[PDB]
Amino acid sequence: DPILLRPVDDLELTVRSANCLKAEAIHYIGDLVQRTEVELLKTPNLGKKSLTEIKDVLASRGLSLGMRLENWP
């Protein structure tokens, strides 16, 4: 797969959600989508709009929540 190894900075994320995800210590898109809705929503200063826009960019990049990973990284 050539799309899972791209850095999470490619997602064009705002600063607040970027800081929240850095606190979650996520740097790969597969690691970004390994978790779920509530698990990422529990983080402080991250609202429904942040994860909503994350899902929007994932859908615009041909991804949809509910997948799983195998042998990564």
């Binding site: 791209r6 850095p7 900075d9 490619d10």
Partner: protein
């Protein structure tokens, strides 16, 4: 820069154009250059290097 125009402009003249401090325009240019530095756009450009 001098892109598709006659002359380039120092940031003071652009600040007069946009009714804003020379500093703010420096910030805008730095932010835009940072944005274009990002991948998914730098590949086609850096193929010219």
């Amino acid at each position: 820069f001098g892109i598709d125009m006659n002359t380039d402009y120092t940031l003071e003249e652009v600040g007069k154009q946009f009714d804003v401090t020379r500093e703010r325009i420096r910030q805008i240019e730095a932010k835009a250059l940072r944005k274009l530095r990002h991948p998914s756009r730098s590949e086609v450009l850096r193929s010219f290097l």
